[PDB]
Structures are given as C-alpha cells and as structure tokens.
Amino acid sequence: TGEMGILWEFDPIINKWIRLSMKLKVERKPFAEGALREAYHTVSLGVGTDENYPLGTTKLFPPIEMISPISKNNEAMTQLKNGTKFVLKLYKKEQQASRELYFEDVKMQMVCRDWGNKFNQKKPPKKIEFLMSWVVELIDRSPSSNGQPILCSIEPLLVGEFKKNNSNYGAVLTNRSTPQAFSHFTYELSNKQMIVVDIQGVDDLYTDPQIHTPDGKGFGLGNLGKAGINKFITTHKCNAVCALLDLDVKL
Ligand SMILES: Nc1ncnc2c1ncn2[C@@H]1O[C@H](COP(=O)(O)OP(=O)(O)O)[C@@H](O)[C@H]1O
Ligand SMILES: [Mg+2]
Numbered sequence: 001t002g003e004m005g006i007l008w009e010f011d012p013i014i015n016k017w018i019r020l021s022m023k024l025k026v027e028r029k030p031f032a033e034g035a036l037r038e039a040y041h042t043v044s045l046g047v048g049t050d051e052n053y054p055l056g057t058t059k060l061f062p063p064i065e066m067i068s069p070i071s072k073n074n075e076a077m078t079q080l081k082n083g084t085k086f087v088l089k090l091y092k093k094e095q096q097a098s099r100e101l102y103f104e105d106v107k108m109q110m111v112c113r114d115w116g117n118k119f120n121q122k123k124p125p126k127k128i129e130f131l132m133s134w135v136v137e138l139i140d141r142s143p144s145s146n147g148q149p150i151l152c153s154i155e156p157l158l159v160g161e162f163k164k165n166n167s168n169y170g171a172v173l174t175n176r177s178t179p180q181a182f183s184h185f186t187y188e189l190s191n192k193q194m195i196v197v198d199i200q201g202v203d204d205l206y207t208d209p210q211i212h213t214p215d216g217k218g219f220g221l222g223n224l225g226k227a228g229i230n231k232f233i234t235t236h237k238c239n240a241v242c243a244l245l246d247l248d249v250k251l
C-alpha cells in the first residue's frame with residue numbers, strides 16, 4: 001500500500017532546507033549493507049508539498065530560519081517522481097544517531113556535489129557527479145525506540161557494478177586515477193581544511209562519500225579528523241589526473 005514521509009532537500013547555494021512530502025513503498029528486507037547502514041529497494045508513489053503537515057513548534061530542527069518558505073524549485077519532483085525506483089537507507093541498530101545527524105549526513109553529500117562541480121570546471125579527463133540525497137521522516141511508523149521518530153535517508157538507485165575506490169581510512173581499493181585525483185584535489189583546493197574520501201559508486205557517479213576536517217567536527221560519524229587525513233596522505237600516489245590538474249606532489 002505504501003507510506004507517507006516528510007521529504008527534506010538541502011540547497012547549498014541559498015543555505016536552506018526545502019520541505020516536501022512523498023508517498024513511498026519500501027521492501028521489507030535490505031538488498032545491501034555497509035559499515036553503518038542497510039539499503040532497501042523502494043518505489044515512489046509520488047512527490048507533493050508539505051502543506052498538509054504543519055511544522056508548528058519552536059526545539060525545531062532544522063530551525064525555522066534555515067527553511068525556505070517556498071519549495072516550487074527542487075530536484076525531488078523530477079528525480080523521485082511517481083514510479084521511480086530508488087534507495088532508502090537506515091542506520092543499523094541506532095544509539096549514536098540524533099535527528100541532527102541525518103540532516104548533517106545529507107548536507108555533507110550536498111557539499112560533495114559542490115566539490116564535484118568545482119572539480120569538473122577544471123576540465124578533467126573524466127568528469128564526476130555525486131547523487132542527490134534527502135532526509136525522510138517516516139511519519140506513518142510508530143517511534144518504537146526510545147520514543148524517537150523514525151528517520152532515514154533516500155537517494156537514487158545506481159544501476160551497474162558498484163565499486164569502492166577509497167575508504168575513509170587510507171585504503172586505495174581500485175587502480176583508477178579519477179577517484180584518487182579528486183580526493184587530492186579537494187584537499188589542496190580547500191587549503192587542507194577538508195578532504196572528500198569514501199569515493200564509491202558506479203563508474204564516476206558516486207554516493208555516500210565522507211569528509212574529514214582537521215578538527216574532526218561536523219560531517220557525521222565518519223569524520224576521523226587529522227588522523228583520517230594523514231591516512232589518506234600515507235597511501236596516496238599521484239597519477240596522470242593529479243598531474244593534469246597541476247596538484248602539489250607533497251600533501
Ligand atoms: N545509491 C545506491 N544504489 C545502489 N546500491 C547502493 C547505493 N548506495 C549504496 N549501495 C549499496 O549499499 C551498500 C551500503 O551502502 P552505504 O552504507 O551507503 O555505503 P558503504 O559501502 O560505504 O557502507 C553499498 O556498499 C552498496 O553495495
Ligand atoms: Mg558518509
């Protein structure tokens with residue numbers, strides 16, 4: 001039959017969240033799992049507005065000043081339109097997850113999308129793209145728990161061979177140039193204030209990346225700070241794409 005959700009889209013250029021609704025139908029069992037999450041095949045039963053589901057309240061997160069009152073322009077209306085097959089992700093059985101973490105995870109994926117666009121403006125041999133991600137509140141479910149409402153993230157379905165190219169702790173898992181050159185690009189151009197790793201997906205369409213920052217603050221559970229940054233440095237070998245972008249040989 002399906003279930004309702006409040007759907008949240010972040011737009012970095014206006015620095016605001018857009019609040020929508022959708023109906024979806026999720027398979028009972030996951031098709032894949034990672035270190036932290038389980039992934040479920042899902043179908044869209046349509047995207048709509050949030051008009052029927054008022055915010056009310058204060059404790060509100062995101063805070064009201066961070067939400068656009070207008071939602072007419074969005075990615076969800078196209079990318080999650082009625083009939084679309086996509087992916088829903090839940091944290092495995094959890095304790096360290098707050099409401100804020102889900103939004104932080106989605107914002108992080110959006111920040112990576114901006115880095116992808118920045119990398120592409122340099123005219124690399126292979127352009128890259130990160131998938132959209134959204135927060136969904138599964139408002140038809142009881143809170144179970146703990147009493148906490150049920151949240152998840154959703155993303156488009158990748159079709160093809162899913163491959164991890166690097167991890168968030170120094171592993172270089174494939175021999176391809178582009179994913180490693182991009183990680184290096186983000187480190188140099190950010191004045192070493194961040195790096196994008198966990199570059200994974202189908203060809204150069206990536207998802208669930210991870211950012212480290214020197215102070216380790218923000219960017220979710222997987223931000224391993226200076227330690228994560230140094231691990232990347234220890235195993236990074238510059239390649240033909242690094243050289244084309246004129247990246248520093250010393251990190
Ligand atoms: N958008 C997607 N489309 C298809 N399969 C996916 C997608 N995202 C993740 N997967 C699969 O689900 C697994 C778990 O996803 P996730 O926890 O996000 O990544 P990780 O592999 O870093 O743990 C992945 O290893 C991959 O096999
Ligand atoms: Mg991540």
Ligand SMILES: [Mg+2]
Pocket residue numbers: 216217218219220221222223
């Ligand atoms: Mg953190």
Ligand SMILES: [Zn+2]
Pocket residue numbers: 180181184236237238239242247
């Ligand atoms: Zn390099």
